[PDB]
Amino acid sequence: DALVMDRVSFVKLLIENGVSMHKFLTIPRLEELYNTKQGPTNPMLFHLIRDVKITLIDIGLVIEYLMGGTYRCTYTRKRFRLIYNSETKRFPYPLNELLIWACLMKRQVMARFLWQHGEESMAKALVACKIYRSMAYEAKQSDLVDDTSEELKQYSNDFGQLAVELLEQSFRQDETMAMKLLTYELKNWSNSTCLKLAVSSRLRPFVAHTCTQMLLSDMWMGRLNMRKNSWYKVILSILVPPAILMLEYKTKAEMSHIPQS
Amino acid sequence: ITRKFYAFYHAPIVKFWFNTLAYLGFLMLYTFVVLVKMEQLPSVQEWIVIAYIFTYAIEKVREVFMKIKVWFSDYFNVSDTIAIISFFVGFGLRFGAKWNYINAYDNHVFVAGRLIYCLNIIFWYVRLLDFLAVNQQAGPYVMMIGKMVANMFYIVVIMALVLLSFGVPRKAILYPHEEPSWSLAKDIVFHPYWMIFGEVYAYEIDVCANDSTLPTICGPGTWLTPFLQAVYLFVQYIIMVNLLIAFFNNVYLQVKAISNIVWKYQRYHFIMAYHEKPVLPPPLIILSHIVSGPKLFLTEEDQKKLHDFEEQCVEMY
Amino acid sequence: AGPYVMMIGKMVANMFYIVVIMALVLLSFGVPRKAILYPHEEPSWSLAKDIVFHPYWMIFGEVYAYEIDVCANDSTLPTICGPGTWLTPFLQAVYLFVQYIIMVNLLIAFFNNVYLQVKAISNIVWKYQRYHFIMAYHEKPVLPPPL
Ligand SMILES: CC(C)CCC[C@@H](C)[C@H]1CC[C@H]2[C@@H]3CC=C4C[C@@H](OC(=O)CCC(=O)O)CC[C@]4(C)[C@H]3CC[C@]12C
Ligand SMILES: CC(C)CCC[C@@H](C)[C@H]1CC[C@H]2[C@@H]3CC=C4C[C@@H](OC(=O)CCC(=O)O)CC[C@]4(C)[C@H]3CC[C@]12C
Ligand SMILES: CC(C)CCC[C@@H](C)[C@H]1CC[C@H]2[C@@H]3CC=C4C[C@@H](OC(=O)CCC(=O)O)CC[C@]4(C)[C@H]3CC[C@]12C
Ligand SMILES: CC(C)CCC[C@@H](C)[C@H]1CC[C@H]2[C@@H]3CC=C4C[C@@H](OC(=O)CCC(=O)O)CC[C@]4(C)[C@H]3CC[C@]12C
Ligand SMILES: CC(C)CCC[C@@H](C)[C@H]1CC[C@H]2[C@@H]3CC=C4C[C@@H](OC(=O)CCC(=O)O)CC[C@]4(C)[C@H]3CC[C@]12C
Description:
The structure is cut from a larger assembly and holds 3 copies of chain A. By secondary structure, chain A is mainly α. The first copy, chain A, has 15 helices and no strands. In chain A, helix 8 packs parallel to helix 12. Chain A is elongated. The N and C termini of chain A lie far apart (49 Å). In chain A, 36% of the residues are buried. Chains in contact: A-B, B-C. At the B-C interface, helix 2, helix 6, helix 7, helix 8 and helix 10 of B face helix 2 and helix 4 of C. The complex binds cholesterol hemisuccinate (5 copies). One cholesterol hemisuccinate sits at the interface of chains B and C. The PDB classes it as transferase. Keywords: CryoEM, Truncated mouse TRPM7, membrane protein, transferase. 3.3 angstrom structure of mouse TRPM7 with EDTA. Chains A, B, C: Transient receptor potential cation channel subfamily M member 7. The organism of A, B, C is Mus musculus.
């Protein structure tokens, strides 16, 4: 009831005492909690379901629509369509499901509460930024009264600032590890790199941070080692192929954070 | 040792510099082609040019097919379609043409082929700014020029109204006996346009006076044009081109801060193209299309050592 | 006058990539202007001189007013009236617009907004090199090098 009625500070108390989100969320707890009009709802969510009462497969068609490209949401895969259509009806990561729920239903304080305690939080900030931003773009076009694109933008810019602040946090503690956070496969969010997930939404303060502009400067070098290598020795070694063999390079301890082919 | 060739050639620096060295070879050959006398049969240099633009177009089709309206968003891809399409319109009229052979090599089809062949180098020199825009310092200026051309447009419109409102009564006073021709447009825009840029046409002012060129134009009324040119040069050169310096001057810092971030963002899409380009430049790409992700690899140990680094950074946040 | 001499080099080293863009605009007008106007050429090193030469002085005031509209009356160079030479007033119009209204006017904005930080840096670089200047004159003998 506290989730449907948007009581954030009762979700705080009520999981702080004794309720695990594991074994709370079953599949009919999402169908319910998604198709209830007993709280503040998102009126344009049904406009996105018009691409097709509400089933989770019709939800992940919305999520695959909002996060474009080859984004495969977990609900539309074969294993979920076999557990669906009738212990196994729980979710392995429940707060990844309620972060998407609280972003689609346009309830922000619930979303910034469900964000801040789960695993892989900087990826949830960017997923939430992309979902909000593309709902804003799919609300500027087709609405007349309280279009709320002015409201959904500044909800994507409140998560897209969290992502930046977390990456500025993790950059200052270790740099070779923070550059690993940018490109590791997420495996919950459709095997998307965190940095690609922040380029799909055009999140310029993330891609222009010194963590991503340092990783791009380490992908530009490739295997070579331009910290000590001559700049002109690249052009010389292009023109003179026996000058390739003796310039400089990098070892696998230095190529660890660089995503190789 | 043979992993040092595979390691060297697949770096994006080496794909980049290998591509721009062959691009500067393309421009040097293409302006030797263009500047020197064209003949009926193409020279050695010209087939290298057509080989570059043909196989370059093949690589652009491969880069579009591996979504079209995404590719038209960059301003150096709209210029690539116009460069490649108008090159072969120029090469169609150059090569597939009637000779009408003489000591005079000018036939009406060959000449237009050579002029669509001369005006086309401009697109490739503009394409050099896509290369000059990849380093830390010259990137924001190239990303800044377009962001300020798109921003001064309504000072340039006011300068064009001042340009017309001097161009029309200056001809109309000086040249009363005209017949309708399209040289009226050329001469009302033409002569007051170069007065912004230094040429005051000093002897053409005071057309009635001695020490003057154009002495045949001494009709009644021509004593007005030094006053019209005086007010025109005052307004244009002292108000308009001096409100444009103030405009760039006060817009510069916000457009540098914006354009620096737009460069830092588009550096991602620039580097991820060079993880996909084959290791040959487009004249040497006759091999790597007859022949034919970037994921990060962590062990099970370091995925856990990374996974409790992220939790520590969030809790410290 | 110390900081200005220490400042000129610190801003020549700093405007280099606006001058490179001005040199690309300079070439991309210099080559089709010759190529349109002079179709019958043989390979010589006077091609380089004449593609850089005439569009270089247009930044500095000389518009070459009579050489524009080579077909027209009241014109020097009246022998160059081949087909296609009606294009060069449009190329010179776009070249002078871009060069003189965008590039040399983005250079005034560049010096204008860089001036105060380069004056603050260059003043300190002068005050530091004044030490190495005075300690040379505690070592020079008392005679001008002819004496
Ligand atoms: C991106 C990082 C790894 C640094 C490498 C960037 C290069 C791709 C840029 C920086 C310098 C640029 C060069 C700077 C100067 C020139 C000269 C330019 O022609 C002129 O300046 C002629 C001047 C004249 O003749 O008046 C042709 C492009 C070129 C080679 C540019 C090609 C692209 C370059 C090499
Ligand atoms: C003989 C004459 C015609 C030669 C004149 C050359 C111009 C036609 C070239 C010189 C500089 C070029 C510009 C250089 C940089 C850009 C930036 C480019 O935009 C960007 O890359 C990002 C800016 C944005 O996102 O708006 C748009 C094209 C533009 C204006 C180019 C348009 C064509 C320009 C004006
Ligand atoms: C829209 C604002 C900026 C003012 C209108 C623009 C006018 C200042 C000028 C610009 C060019 C002028 C035109 C310049 C050239 C001609 C061609 C000429 O008409 C013809 O050649 C038709 C006779 C023929 O072709 O035999 C004389 C008038 C006309 C249309 C002028 C009419 C007024 C125009 C459109
Ligand atoms: C060729 C004929 C037409 C005369 C042209 C004069 C130039 C060749 C002279 C005039 C001013 C001179 C400059 C005057 C001052 C300096 C500052 C000097 O740097 C410093 O003294 C310290 C600056 C720093 O520390 O970076 C570097 C040389 C430079 C640019 C000089 C380079 C040569 C310049 C441009
Ligand atoms: C690097 C970017 C900026 C573009 C490349 C610069 C090209 C625009 C221009 C600059 C000078 C031009 C050269 C100017 C002079 C000549 C001399 C001339 O060649 C010769 O003299 C050989 C004939 C002989 O010597 O008998 C004609 C082509 C060439 C190389 C031109 C080829 C194209 C060049 C290199």
